Design a protein around this ligand. Structure first.
Ligand SMILES: C[C@]12CCc3c(ccc4cc(O)ccc34)[C@@H]1CCC2=O
Ligand SMILES: C[C@]12CCc3c(ccc4cc(O)ccc34)[C@@H]1CCC2=O
Lengths: 129, 129
């Protein structure tokens, strides 16, 4: 049924692992085929597995991206959760890091219905040699 | 006008300080007089400054409660932002720490229009004696 609070922590953490290894196939599978992503939040949503698969295609492709949690998945009892992680990637030629908080609502099947990634330039940090 | 990504970080960080010292008056003032709180997210919203002030009245009163950021406020360009923080208080007689993430939308006046505190028992750590 609707993911318990503990199941949300497990799903949202596994998602980070799939993003980490750039497993787009697996990432997309975690999404409902009509899910909506807003990354960055503030930007128009993208709906559907196809468009979403293209989003991660271009985002995890092209360059080197690692991601991992930096704190506990805060999970609720209505199939939702927010998590702190850090994205490592090459920005403006430089190896940079991006602090992000993802909020995720799942459905009665465990799949992500709604994805919202909170970040902007104030969360971007370029790293010295 | 609508708070900038940087204004958001400052606003949301000030909030935590207000909660921390339990300044209910100043906390309520950060709220639009028709703001809606959802703490814990999943629970029915509470509308209006009067119901919100009551919520913090009982939430911050009666017991001891500290709260401080445990990471950077992730802030977007639409007056929104999410923050990671920790809540210290007495739960079930025992001193406990609670991991929470607040999502907040601000209006064109810099006041909180929507509050959403993601957390549950899975984020509750009772401090061993
Ligand atoms: C998209 C991105 C790579 C991966 C990524 C970013 C931001 C938020 C994310 C949120 C996710 O849940 C998964 C991946 C990202 C980076 C911002 C700029 C960029 O290169
Ligand atoms: C409500 C509470 C005190 C304050 C508080 C809690 C949880 C989340 C919060 C989120 C906030 O943005 C502000 C205050 C709280 C505690 C959970 C149990 C408790 O008594």
């Amino acid at each position: 049924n609707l993911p318990t609070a503990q199941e949300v922590q497990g799903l949202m953490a596994r998602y980070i692992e799939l993003v980490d290894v750039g497993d787009i196939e697996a990432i997309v599978q975690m999404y409902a085929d009509d899910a909506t992503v807003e990354n960055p939040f503030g930007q128009p949503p993208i709906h559907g597995r196809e468009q979403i698969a293209a989003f991660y295609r271009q985002g995890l492709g092209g360059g080197k991206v690692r991601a991992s949690l930096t704190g506990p998945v805060r999970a609720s009892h209505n199939g939702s959760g927010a998590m702190p992680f850090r994205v490592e990637m090459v920005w403006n030629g430089q190896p940079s890091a991006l602090d992000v908080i993802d909020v995720c609502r799942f459905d009665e099947h465990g799949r992500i219905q709604t994805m919202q990634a909170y970040w902007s330039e104030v969360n971007l940090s370029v790293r010295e040699p």
